[PDB]
C-alpha cells in the first residue's frame, strides 16, 4: 500500500477500484456496510478509504 495524497491528480487503485482524479474531503455519511459511491450517471463519486 502506497502513501495517501489529496488535491493532486493521481492514478489511484483502492482494492481494485481504479480511477484517476483529485481526492478531496466530503461529508456524505456512508453506511458501515457501504464501501463505494456512485451517482445518477453511475459515476464513482464518493469513496471510503
Amino acid at each position: 500500500s502506497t502513501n495517501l495524497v489529496k488535491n493532486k491528480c493521481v492514478n489511484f487503485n483502492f482494492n481494485g477500484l481504479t480511477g484517476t482524479g483529485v481526492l478531496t474531503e466530503s461529508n456524505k455519511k456512508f453506511l458501515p456496510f457501504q464501501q463505494f459511491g456512485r451517482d445518477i450517471a453511475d459515476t464513482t463519486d464518493a469513496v471510503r478509504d
Binding site: 451517482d39 450517471a41 459515476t43
Partner: peptide, 27 residues
C-alpha cells in the same frame, strides 16, 4: 420561479462530456 422549477448539473461532466458555459451568463 423558473430557475427553482427546472433542475444532472455536473453528473454528466465527469466522462469528457464537457459543457461549454454560455457566452452570456445567466445574470
Amino acid at each position: 420561479l423558473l430557475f427553482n422549477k427546472v433542475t444532472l448539473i455536473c453528473a454528466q461532466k465527469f466522462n469528457g462530456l464537457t459543457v461549454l458555459p454560455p457566452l452570456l451568463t445567466d445574470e
